Coordinates of C-alpha atoms and ligand atoms in Angstrom, one line a residue:
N173 CA 0.0 0.0 0.4
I174 CA 2.2 3.2 -1.5
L175 CA 1.2 6.7 -0.4
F176 CA 4.3 8.1 -2.4
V177 CA 7.4 6.4 -4.2
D178 CA 9.9 8.5 -6.3
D179 CA 12.4 5.9 -8.4
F180 CA 14.2 9.0 -9.6
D181 CA 13.9 7.5 -13.2
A182 CA 11.4 10.2 -14.6
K183 CA 13.0 11.4 -18.2
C184 CA 14.5 14.4 -16.6
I185 CA 18.0 15.4 -15.2
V186 CA 16.6 17.0 -12.1
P187 CA 14.3 15.6 -9.3
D188 CA 10.5 16.1 -9.8
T189 CA 10.4 19.9 -9.2
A190 CA 7.0 20.2 -7.9
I191 CA 8.0 17.3 -4.9
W192 CA 11.7 18.3 -4.9
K193 CA 13.2 22.0 -3.8
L194 CA 16.5 22.6 -3.2
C195 CA 18.2 23.1 0.4
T196 CA 18.9 27.2 0.9
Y197 CA 21.5 28.5 2.9
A198 CA 21.4 28.8 6.8
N199 CA 24.0 29.3 9.4
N200 CA 24.0 25.9 11.0
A201 CA 25.8 22.7 10.4
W202 CA 24.1 20.9 7.6
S203 CA 23.0 24.3 5.9
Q204 CA 25.8 26.8 6.2
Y205 CA 27.5 25.2 2.3
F206 CA 24.2 25.8 0.7
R207 CA 25.3 29.4 0.2
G208 CA 26.2 30.4 -3.4
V209 CA 25.4 26.8 -5.0
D210 CA 24.2 27.9 -8.2
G211 CA 20.6 25.7 -8.9
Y212 CA 20.6 22.1 -9.3
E213 CA 24.8 22.3 -9.7
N214 CA 25.1 19.7 -6.9
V215 CA 22.1 18.1 -7.8
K216 CA 20.9 15.5 -10.7
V217 CA 18.8 12.9 -11.6
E218 CA 20.8 9.8 -13.6
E219 CA 20.7 6.2 -13.7
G220 CA 17.9 6.0 -11.9
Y221 CA 19.8 7.7 -8.9
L222 CA 19.2 11.1 -7.0
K223 CA 22.9 12.1 -6.8
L224 CA 23.7 14.9 -4.3
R225 CA 27.5 16.2 -4.3
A226 CA 29.5 17.8 -1.8
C227 CA 32.8 19.6 -3.8
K228 CA 34.7 22.3 -3.1
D229 CA 34.4 24.7 -6.5
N230 CA 37.5 27.4 -6.3
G231 CA 37.7 27.7 -2.7
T232 CA 34.1 27.6 -2.2
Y233 CA 32.5 24.4 0.1
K234 CA 28.9 23.4 -2.0
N235 CA 26.7 21.1 -0.3
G236 CA 23.8 18.7 -2.1
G237 CA 20.6 18.4 -1.0
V238 CA 16.5 18.7 -1.4
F239 CA 13.4 18.6 0.4
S240 CA 9.9 17.3 -0.6
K241 CA 7.5 20.0 -0.7
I242 CA 4.8 17.6 0.3
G243 CA 4.6 15.9 4.1
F244 CA 3.1 12.6 5.0
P245 CA 0.7 11.7 8.0
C246 CA 1.0 9.0 10.6
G247 CA 0.0 5.6 10.2
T248 CA 3.0 5.2 7.6
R249 CA 6.8 4.1 7.1
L250 CA 9.3 6.1 5.2
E251 CA 11.9 3.6 3.1
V252 CA 15.1 5.7 1.9
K253 CA 17.6 3.5 0.0
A254 CA 20.8 5.3 -0.3
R255 CA 24.8 4.7 -0.2
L256 CA 28.0 7.3 -0.2
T257 CA 30.3 6.5 -3.1
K258 CA 32.9 7.2 -1.0
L259 CA 34.0 8.4 2.8
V260 CA 34.7 12.1 3.1
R261 CA 36.2 13.2 6.4
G262 CA 33.8 16.5 7.4
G263 CA 31.3 14.7 5.2
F264 CA 27.7 14.9 7.0
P265 CA 25.2 13.0 4.7
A266 CA 21.4 12.9 6.2
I267 CA 18.2 11.4 5.2
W268 CA 15.8 12.8 7.8
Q269 CA 12.3 14.6 8.1
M270 CA 11.0 17.7 9.4
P271 CA 7.3 18.6 10.3
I272 CA 5.6 20.9 7.9
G273 CA 3.8 23.9 9.3
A274 CA 4.8 23.5 13.2
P275 CA 5.9 26.2 15.3
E276 CA 9.8 27.0 16.1
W277 CA 12.4 24.5 15.7
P278 CA 12.4 21.9 18.0
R279 CA 8.6 22.3 19.0
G280 CA 7.5 20.0 16.1
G281 CA 10.0 17.7 16.2
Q282 CA 12.8 16.0 13.8
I283 CA 13.4 12.9 13.1
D284 CA 16.3 11.6 11.5
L285 CA 16.7 7.7 9.6
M286 CA 20.6 8.3 8.6
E287 CA 23.2 10.5 9.4
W288 CA 27.1 9.9 9.2
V289 CA 30.2 11.4 10.7
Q290 CA 34.1 10.7 10.7
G291 CA 34.1 10.5 14.5
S292 CA 32.6 7.2 14.1
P293 CA 33.1 5.9 10.5
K294 CA 31.8 2.4 11.1
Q295 CA 28.2 3.3 12.2
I296 CA 24.9 5.8 11.3
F297 CA 23.0 7.6 13.7
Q298 CA 19.3 7.4 14.1
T299 CA 17.8 10.4 16.2
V300 CA 14.7 12.2 17.6
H301 CA 14.3 16.0 18.3
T302 CA 11.5 17.6 20.7
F303 CA 11.4 20.5 22.6
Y304 CA 11.1 17.9 25.7
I305 CA 14.3 16.3 24.9
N306 CA 16.4 19.5 23.5
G307 CA 14.5 22.3 25.4
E308 CA 15.6 26.1 23.9
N309 CA 19.1 25.7 22.9
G310 CA 19.7 21.5 22.8
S311 CA 20.9 20.2 19.6
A312 CA 21.7 16.4 20.6
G313 CA 18.3 15.3 20.6
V314 CA 18.0 11.3 21.9
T315 CA 20.2 8.6 19.5
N316 CA 20.2 5.3 19.1
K317 CA 23.1 4.6 21.2
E318 CA 23.3 0.7 20.3
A319 CA 23.5 1.5 16.8
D320 CA 25.3 -1.4 14.8
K321 CA 29.1 -0.1 15.3
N322 CA 30.5 -2.7 12.2
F323 CA 28.1 -0.9 9.1
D324 CA 29.7 0.2 5.6
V325 CA 27.2 3.5 4.6
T326 CA 29.2 3.1 0.9
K327 CA 27.3 0.0 -0.2
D328 CA 23.1 0.4 -0.5
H329 CA 20.9 0.4 2.6
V330 CA 17.0 1.1 3.2
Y331 CA 16.8 3.7 6.1
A332 CA 13.5 3.6 7.6
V333 CA 11.3 5.1 10.1
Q334 CA 7.6 3.7 10.8
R335 CA 5.5 6.8 12.7
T336 CA 2.2 5.9 14.6
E337 CA 0.4 7.8 17.2
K338 CA 2.2 5.4 19.5
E339 CA 6.0 5.5 18.3
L340 CA 8.6 6.3 15.9
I341 CA 10.0 2.7 15.1
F342 CA 13.6 2.9 13.3
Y343 CA 14.9 0.1 10.9
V344 CA 18.0 -0.8 8.6
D345 CA 17.8 -3.0 6.1
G346 CA 14.1 -3.9 7.2
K347 CA 15.8 -4.7 10.5
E348 CA 13.9 -2.8 13.7
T349 CA 17.1 -1.2 15.5
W350 CA 15.4 1.3 17.9
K351 CA 12.3 2.7 19.3
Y352 CA 11.0 6.3 20.4
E353 CA 7.6 6.0 22.3
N354 CA 5.0 8.1 23.2
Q355 CA 4.8 8.7 26.8
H356 CA 1.4 10.2 27.0
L357 CA 2.2 13.1 29.1
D358 CA 0.0 16.7 28.9
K359 CA 0.6 18.3 25.0
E360 CA 1.9 21.4 26.9
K361 CA 4.6 18.9 27.6
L362 CA 5.7 18.7 23.4
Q363 CA 7.5 15.1 24.5
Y364 CA 5.4 13.4 20.9
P365 CA 5.0 16.2 18.6
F366 CA 5.1 13.7 15.4
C367 CA 1.2 12.9 14.6
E368 CA 0.3 16.6 14.9
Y369 CA 2.2 17.8 11.7
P370 CA 3.0 16.1 8.1
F371 CA 6.4 15.4 7.8
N372 CA 8.6 16.0 5.0
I373 CA 11.7 14.2 3.1
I374 CA 15.2 15.8 3.2
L375 CA 18.3 14.3 1.6
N376 CA 21.2 16.0 1.7
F377 CA 25.0 15.4 1.3
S378 CA 26.4 18.4 3.2
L379 CA 30.2 19.4 4.6
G380 CA 31.3 20.0 8.2
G381 CA 34.4 21.6 9.5
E382 CA 34.1 24.9 11.6
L383 CA 30.8 27.1 12.1
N384 CA 31.4 30.7 13.6
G385 CA 34.8 29.3 14.5
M386 CA 33.5 26.0 16.2
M387 CA 33.9 22.3 15.0
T388 CA 30.5 20.9 14.2
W389 CA 29.8 17.2 14.9
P390 CA 30.8 15.9 11.3
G391 CA 34.1 17.6 12.6
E392 CA 37.4 18.8 10.0
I393 CA 37.0 18.7 6.2
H394 CA 40.0 16.9 4.5
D395 CA 40.1 18.6 1.1
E396 CA 41.7 15.5 -0.4
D397 CA 38.8 13.1 0.2
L398 CA 36.4 15.7 -1.8
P399 CA 33.9 15.6 -4.0
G400 CA 31.9 12.7 -2.5
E401 CA 28.2 12.2 -3.7
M402 CA 25.0 10.4 -1.5
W403 CA 22.9 7.8 -4.4
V404 CA 19.5 8.0 -3.4
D405 CA 17.7 5.1 -5.6
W406 CA 14.3 5.6 -4.2
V407 CA 11.9 7.1 -1.8
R408 CA 8.9 5.4 -0.8
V409 CA 5.9 6.0 2.2
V410 CA 4.0 3.1 2.6
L411 CA 0.8 3.3 4.6
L412 CA -0.1 0.9 7.2
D413 CA -3.1 -1.1 7.3
Ligands
LIG537 CA1 15.9 4.6 -8.5

């Protein structure tokens, strides 16, 4: 029961322009190097893949990323098949979801199906953010501390999150990794916002290094590792029975 699928096999060199929008600059770790990215120069559809490129163009770091203009309800599972072409030190690829039309971050939550950093190069991270976890200023969220530590992100894997009123279930390659559960506190506490807003799909390969003179989580950029790409074979949203 498929609510949405993109196989990136349209007769087009860019992703569906009604569904996918190019990521824009913001002064944060994942967004700082969308600055000066000229249209689709780091984003194409080729050979059935969405290809998101991270590179240094003439001394400027440039990220590759899109986000979905549509969001999805509860009672659904998001599956994204992707690999990195290459491990890149300073590389910061991600597959994740933001609420559409929620209050200021992180009051509507955030779901990360996949982030990779050089600091733990044989795992990925699956993470949840809420106002109840992060408060005003926090940015760590709650992450799967028992994440697979013997994992090769440069092979194809299916990253998934099943979102219901009761819980988020995380999977890698169809295998459950962890659960973030509704505690059913007063709504006032903002502990489980995940069914009050549609959630979109964000696919990016970003570059880390320092943000305002402070080392980001993905850490130092090694220019000799660039360029790198994330290849997304498909995204689908399944409606649960
Ligand atoms: Ca494909």
